[PDB]
Amino acid sequence: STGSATTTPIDSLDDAYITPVQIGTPAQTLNLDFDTGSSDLWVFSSETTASEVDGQTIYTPSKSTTAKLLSGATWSISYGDGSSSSGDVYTDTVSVGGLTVTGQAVESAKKVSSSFTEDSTIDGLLGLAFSTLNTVSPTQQKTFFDNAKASLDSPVFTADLGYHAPGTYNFGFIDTTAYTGSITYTAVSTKQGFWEWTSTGYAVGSGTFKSTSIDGIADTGTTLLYLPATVVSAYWAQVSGAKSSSSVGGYVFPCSATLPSFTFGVGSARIVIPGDYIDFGPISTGSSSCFGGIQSSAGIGINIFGDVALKAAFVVFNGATTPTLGFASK
């Protein structure tokens, strides 16, 4: 089997991407944030505290003839941006782009933090990291990809995120028309539960390539590119007027600037992030200070190849017995 679904930016900055997901019988369609940095499929629901729902579409398990309460199971998750959610668990039928999994754990939110309430465009998350990170207790549950894998034509999914435009998540096949050149594959460590890999270096603009190992995760659920402070300082030094602002919480730059590109290494291959991809617009409405798309990871504990990097590539998440990541230009 295969599946194919369009993913759409939630706003003009590509702050996140939503993908329609069918849950239950008859289908209830929710727009979920596909997140290769976490491993829970959770949704706004009929159980979510009413004051914490503000425009989202909700899953109502009592209206699904295939929903079953997973007795005694709860979940609770906190994300790197400080947001959180928690609740109980159903199993139900879940379909993505024509690909159907029966018995998928659908984690129903009883509580969500304010940043989720405040984003009316995201109805939940669909995690695509390794199932060892799944938060369901006392019986950990499998991701949608893990449940589907055995049925897929090939044990892979691919992320093709658009810049200011829709893109595609495919399951079970590699669309050879969606990228240029060849796909370069690179080793993955699953030891932290993430799609963790080592980039071979970077360049700023037309600068020379610096060979240096950068361990990080491929994370579709993170907007920006988080890299070591040395690297980030080298990038923003090429932008007149750019500075790290403690009050804003990162590097800002004059909105009148033209940003240089940023290249990262995948083995001997190179992925080029155009400068425009690194502009996240005014820090506040009407400001001439703009927020940078490349930020320091020093306060995280891990480097994060978020959407800013991944949208410049066609990315293969290869879930073979020994997982690997593949990157192509497009």
Write a brief caption for the model.
This protein has helices at 114-117, 144-148, 229-236, 307-310, and strands at 3-9, 17-23, 28-35, 41-43, 68-78, 84-96, 99-112, 124-127, 156-160, 167-171, 184-187, 196-204, 210-218, 225-227, 243-245, 250-254, 262-266, 269-273, 279-282, 289-292, 294-296, 303-305, 314-318, 324-328. By secondary structure, it is mainly beta. It has 2 domains: 5-174, Acid Proteases (Cathepsin D, subunit A, domain 1, Beta Barrel), CATH 2.40.70; 175-330, Cathepsin D, subunit A, domain 1 (Beta Barrel).
Question: What features would you describe in this structure?
Answer:
- This protein has 330 residues and is mainly β.
- It has two domains: 5-174, Cathepsin D, subunit A, domain 1 (Beta Barrel); 175-330, Acid Proteases (Cathepsin D, subunit A, domain 1).
- It is built from four helices and 24 strands.
- The chain has helices at 114-117, 144-148, 229-236, 307-310; strands at 3-9, 17-23, 28-35, 41-43, 68-78, 84-96, 99-112, 124-127, 156-160, 167-171, 184-187, 196-204, 210-218, 225-227, 243-245, 250-254, 262-266, 269-273, 279-282, 289-292, 294-296, 303-305, 314-318, 324-328.
- The longest helix is centred in the last third of the chain and has 8 residues, at 229-236.
- The two termini are 25 Å apart.
- This is Endothiapepsin.
- It catalyses: Hydrolysis of proteins with specificity similar to that of pepsin A, prefers hydrophobic residues at P1 and P1', but does not cleave 14-Ala-|-Leu-15 in the B chain of insulin or Z-Glu-Tyr. Clots milk.
